[PDB]
Design a protein around this ligand. Structure first.
Ligand code: ANP
Ligand code: MG
Length: 332
């Protein structure tokens, strides 16, 4: 009868009654995790007296108090509810966010898989702040934190005998072009044989043996990135043993989702969605071409973090971000 609606409702309920030990449940497969993070109102917004229209009453529920006018101009609220694996409020720090998003994926690369974590949302929603550090401070961002746990795990008995070497890369995608951020914005070439795997010729891999090393490459890369979006940022952590790639973690700082380059940005985001959904089961773009091998394997996991700016003036941008997020998790 209305089985489709019944399915959507059951999925919402299931997500609403899940325990944190769901995505972080080893011996259990969860290739796709979707979260949302609300940032607090900033100085400028508070000064302009922007109203905060976002509430996160539980760890999986986010509420949008959408301002509306009836035909006769009467003011009311259409309070909409969204459910995610994890919903973070304005008091959540980067370490807390990191703990429930990228942290559970590190093990995946040591188990020989390919993990990806994406920061998605509108311009100024907190994407760069979350992935790269507060602003500036590399150590306080997910790239750093993830690196920190990679060195801790590699020194664990279960992995010691792997004799792995840790490598890092940092590049940005701008208008279908790839630029090495660790090799002075050097423009790189992207090729794809017939067997279809992609290779980024010239991308520089740097050996790191310490978190301080990684922090030096993050500062360097962020210092010469094209703050503001306009590009896709992608910081990678690769594990190698003997000529072979053991595992790889690609952390992506996406461009704002809201000069007709927005066409390339929208195509990449449309492409990203279908690649992630294809993971739990085109019209290609550079981003999805470069990260292709991280969606095709069976031992691959991904996490999507949707950033939201709480201001009333950004309500339409928020709904757009949330609905995109819904469709992504829809494949889990
Ligand atoms: N959780 C947060 N707490 C405090 N400040 C934050 C937080 N998230 C973001 N900000 C700040 O708000 C701005 C948005 O930062 P980021 O620079 O994080 O945005 P995007 O990366 O969201 N923007 P864009 O590059 O235009 O797509 C920066 O000035 C951040 O320092
Ligand atoms: Mg940014």
């Amino acid at each position: 009868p209305n089985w489709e609606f019944a399915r959507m409702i059951k999925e919402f309920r299931v997500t609403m009654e899940c325990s944190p030990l769901t995505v972080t449940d080893p011996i259990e497969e969860h290739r796709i995790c979707v979260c949302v993070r609300k940032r607090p109102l900033n100085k400028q917004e508070l000064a302009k007296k922007e109203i905060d229209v976002i509430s996160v009453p539980s760890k999986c529920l986010l509420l949008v108090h959408e301002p509306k006018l009836k035909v006769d101009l009467t003011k009311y609220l259409e309070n909409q509810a969204f459910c995610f694996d994890f919903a973070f409020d304005e008091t959540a720090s980067n370490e807390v966010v990191y703990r429930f998003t990228a942290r559970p994926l590190v093990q995946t690369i040591f188990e020989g898989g390919k993990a990806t974590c994406f920061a998605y949302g509108q311009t100024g929603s907190g994407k760069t702040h979350t992935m790269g550090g507060d602003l500036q401070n590399a150590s306080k961002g997910i790239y750093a934190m993830a690196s920190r746990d990679v060195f801790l795990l590699k020194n664990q008995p279960r992995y010691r005998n792997l004799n792995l070497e840790v490598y890092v890369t940092f590049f940005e995608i701008y208008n279908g072009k790839v630029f090495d951020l660790l090799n002075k914005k050097a423009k790189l070439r992207v090729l794809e044989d017939s067997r279809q795997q992609v290779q980024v010729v010239g991308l520089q891999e740097y050996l790191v043996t310490c978190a301080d090393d990684v922090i030096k490459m993050i500062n360097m890369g962020s210092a010469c990135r094209t703050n503001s979006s306009r590009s896709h940022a992608c910081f990678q952590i690769l594990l190698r043993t003997k000529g072979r790639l053991h595992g790889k973690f690609s952390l992506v700082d996406l461009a704002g989702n809201e000069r007709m380059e927005g066409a390339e940005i929208n195509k990449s985001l449309l492409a990203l969605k279908e690649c992630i959904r294809a993971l739990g089961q085109f019209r290609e773009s550079k981003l999805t071409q470069v990260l292709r091998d991280s969606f095709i394997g069976e031992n691959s996991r991904t996490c999507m973090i949707a950033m939201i700016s709480p201001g009333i003036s950004s309500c339409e941008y928020t709904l757009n971000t949330l609905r995109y997020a819904d469709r992504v998790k829809e494949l889990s």
